[PDB]
């Protein structure tokens, strides 16, 4: 759900400077949350940077809390 | 004391907020390896005077 | 607090080579501690590199100790 929100806002803002497609934006978004950091496709606008920072900040809030909640259940039968 | 100890920490806290936030404003106005731009930097005179007064209070807070 | 210190020193040093703004520096700093590694905005000076390395070194000291201290409390009522 957070992947879709990033691809929307960045691509929508990128119409002002360097028109990225959905294919090119989805590449950029999933790269930023996986924490590779290619930076071949980049935000080159005042609000585009402002969003992409917030995407990474919101990612820093979510990702570690979801991995910890998964391993919490993972620590603690015959099928039909 | 519990009440008065909480006030002096609030004063030392909120003083150090001002110096950092004042540093934001002077950077917004100012504009080979150049060490001219690194150290000799024209900081604003009215915003300098407030940073000195906060420094004198916090220097005396450490003295007390 | 460490985010502000990086944006100050790098931008202040960057006045010698390629004048970055606070907006552009805050993008670069929060990227380096999140560990994405865009490198679209970069330090192009002898002391600017020297700082940015120390920012990442000081980040390697802080970040893992704060996450471990948080999960230490997280492991171990009715409101008014």
Curated annotation (Swiss-Prot), chain B:
Q: What is the UniProt domain comment for this protein?
A: The cytoplasmic gating ring domain of the closed KCNT1 channel harbors multiple K(+) and Zn(2+) sites, which stabilize the channel in the closed conformation. Under low-Na(+) conditions, the abundant cytoplasmic K(+) ions stabilize the gating ring domain in a closed conformation. The open KCNT1 structure contains at least two Na(+)-sensitive sites in the RCKs where Na(+) binding induces expansion and rotation of the gating ring that opens the inner gate.
Q: What does this protein do?
A: Sodium-activated K(+) channel. Acts as an important mediator of neuronal membrane excitability. Contributes to the delayed outward currents. Regulates of neuronal bursting in sensory neurons. Contributes to synaptic development and plasticity.
What residue ranges carry the coiled-coil annotation? none
Per the record, the similarity remark reads: Belongs to the potassium channel family. Calcium-activated (TC 1.A.1.3) subfamily. KCa4.1/KCNT1 sub-subfamily.
Protein's recorded name: Potassium channel subfamily T member 1
Concerning PTM, the database record says: Phosphorylated by protein kinase C. Phosphorylation of the C-terminal domain increases channel activity.
Quaternary structure and interacting proteins, as annotated: Homotetramer; which constitutes the Na(+)-activated K(+) channel. Interacts with KCNT2; these heterodimer channels differ from the homomers in their unitary conductance, kinetic behavior, subcellular localization, and response to activation of protein kinase C.
What range of the full-length protein does this chain span?
A: 87 to 172 of 1201
Q: Which residues cross the membrane?
A: 7-29, 45-64
Indicate the secretion signal residues: none
Where does the record say this protein resides?
A: Cell membrane
Source superkingdom: Eukaryota
